[PDB]
Design an enzyme around this catalytic site. Structure first.
Site, short mmCIF file in Angstrom:
data_model
loop_
_atom_site.label_atom_id
_atom_site.label_comp_id
_atom_site.label_asym_id
_atom_site.label_seq_id
_atom_site.Cartn_x
_atom_site.Cartn_y
_atom_site.Cartn_z
CD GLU A 35 -3.17 -0.75 0.19
OE1 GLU A 35 -3.11 0.27 -0.50
OE2 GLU A 35 -4.09 -1.59 0.08
CG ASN A 46 -8.80 5.65 -4.31
OD1 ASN A 46 -9.07 5.78 -3.12
ND2 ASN A 46 -7.87 4.82 -4.74
CG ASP A 48 -13.73 6.81 -5.17
OD1 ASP A 48 -12.57 7.24 -5.07
OD2 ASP A 48 -14.30 6.31 -4.21
CB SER A 50 -12.09 8.42 -2.27
OG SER A 50 -11.50 7.27 -2.88
CG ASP A 52 -6.58 4.89 -0.94
OD1 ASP A 52 -7.75 5.16 -0.59
OD2 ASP A 52 -6.30 4.02 -1.78
CG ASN A 59 -10.83 5.40 0.16
OD1 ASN A 59 -10.17 5.65 -0.85
ND2 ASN A 59 -12.10 5.66 0.26
CG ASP A 101 -17.21 -2.52 7.57
OD1 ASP A 101 -18.17 -2.32 8.37
OD2 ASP A 101 -17.16 -2.03 6.40
#
Ligand SMILES: [Cl-]
Ligand SMILES: [Cl-]
Ligand SMILES: [Cl-]
Length: 129
Positions: A35, A46, A48, A50, A52, A59, A101
């Protein structure tokens, strides 16, 4: 900060990630390698819109507030910038929330694609832990 491998393994263990929801420490070290390359200041945009942040590339769509991710949530109740600190505490406490989650560590695409099913114990080889 750019963590040493064994340096990050020790901080991750100390903060309670070793076998957290059944994921051994090498899984977590492996995920951080691919990562962030162990760099707490890693940020990556990202598609979208967003972003990280940090050693575990947490994120802004769900997990932290950066003030620029429309429709987003802040489930870890932190500014995304707190994920960039040389102190990995906010990152670890947030990762704990994420991995409970439902999809486990699959939540980290890099973990799924680059760590899952590999000899992740290699990531902690040589470390005094
Ligand atoms: Cl391991
Ligand atoms: Cl936002
Ligand atoms: Cl799981």
């Amino acid at each position: 900060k750019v963590f040493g491998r064994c340096e990050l393994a020790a901080a991750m263990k100390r903060h309670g990630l070793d076998n957290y929801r059944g994921y051994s420490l090498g899984n977590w070290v492996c995920a951080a390698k691919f990562e962030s390359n162990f760099n707490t200041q890693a940020t990556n945009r990202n598609t979208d819109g967003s972003t990280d942040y940090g050693i575990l590339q947490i994120n802004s769509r769900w997990w932290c507030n950066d003030g620029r991710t429309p429709g987003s949530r802040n489930l870890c109740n932190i500014p995304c910038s707190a994920l960039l600190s040389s102190d990995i505490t906010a990152s670890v406490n947030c990762a704990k929330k994420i991995v409970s989650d439902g999809n486990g560590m699959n939540a980290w695409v890099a973990w799924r694609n680059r760590c899952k099913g590999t000899d992740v114990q290699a990531w902690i080889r040589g470390c005094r832990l």
